[PDB]
Design an enzyme around this catalytic site. Sequence first.
Site, mmCIF file in Angstrom:
data_model
loop_
_atom_site.group_PDB
_atom_site.id
_atom_site.type_symbol
_atom_site.label_atom_id
_atom_site.label_comp_id
_atom_site.label_asym_id
_atom_site.label_seq_id
_atom_site.Cartn_x
_atom_site.Cartn_y
_atom_site.Cartn_z
ATOM 1 N N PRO A 1 0.785 -1.192 0.000
ATOM 2 C CA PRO A 1 0.000 0.000 0.000
ATOM 3 C C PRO A 1 0.824 1.251 0.000
ATOM 4 C CG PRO A 1 -1.069 -1.635 1.387
ATOM 5 C CD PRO A 1 0.214 -2.240 0.873
ATOM 6 N N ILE A 64 -2.974 -2.961 -3.738
ATOM 7 C CA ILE A 64 -3.389 -4.170 -4.503
ATOM 8 C C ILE A 64 -4.404 -4.946 -3.668
ATOM 9 C CG2 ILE A 64 -2.670 -6.327 -5.591
ATOM 10 C CD1 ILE A 64 0.133 -4.880 -5.862
#
EC number: 5.3.2.1
Lengths: 114, 114, 114
Positions: A1, A64
């Site tokens: 992240p 993701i």
Amino acid sequence: PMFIVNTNVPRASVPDGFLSELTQQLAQATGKPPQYIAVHVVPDQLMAFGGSSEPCALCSLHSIGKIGGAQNRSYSKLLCGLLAERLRISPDRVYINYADMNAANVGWNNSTFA
Amino acid sequence: PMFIVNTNVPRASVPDGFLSELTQQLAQATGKPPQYIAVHVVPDQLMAFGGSSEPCALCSLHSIGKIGGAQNRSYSKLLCGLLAERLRISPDRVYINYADMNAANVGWNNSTFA
Amino acid sequence: PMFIVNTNVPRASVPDGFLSELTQQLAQATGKPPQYIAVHVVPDQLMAFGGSSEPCALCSLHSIGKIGGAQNRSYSKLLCGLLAERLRISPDRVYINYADMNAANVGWNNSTFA
């Protein structure tokens, strides 16, 4: 992240330890290993929210996966809480763009995550 | 909506009143109330456009809806016009990334817009 | 295409010629003319990767097409190589977000690329 915070709050008002706190809290909220969390704080910015230059923040969180309706609400409570507490920014003067990245679309370590 | 402009033009060349003008004109263009418009100008950047460093701008507009073919052409005319008039940046040295955000993917005030 | 690099490496460590090198290499890698390639380097940032403030980079490449699984692996090898060689950033401390933009969603020269 990857979490980016852009703010008109001055550099000296960003407390020591803020990047680590963000890193730790995000690892936990997202469920990802801390090693994958990147954080970036940009103070002293020329910005306005609702026409006003009172403290505000424009942010993004790319990840993701782990992006979705309920998850994003929970991230917003967390992040807004931290921005209020640490930078004295009102939550209603914070915008966070959430983006769910495809693994094929994130480069890292001479390749992608696909 | 959130509008960001990154430019190599120096800070002293950004006129007084520019963030308000951007806020006003974007409210009108998007149809959204000015209280929901956030703007951010980042001068003095290290950047090049097509290999040179005359004045240029790399920008984004994130909005929940109000993004599409005709709208975006109209935003580009408006925003390039303003960058040319106020920052003296040629329109052919401006890039604007338009992103249509889902309401669930925008955090604000401890939650999302969903 | 537009390539942006945000890094905690200091400004003086960014070599002269780095924007032109990025421009040239990206023109070659994407196959697009160098006149359409924009590059933006932001040093001295307050950022962390994995909780660590060792050199790192948070980047993005937006392009109208020329984005995909194999292409992005190649771009990541190229880009990470350049960041390692020129800025001394380890490839495993680099993130690159790749975005395939629709031509209607990129503003330029008072219109869009649609």
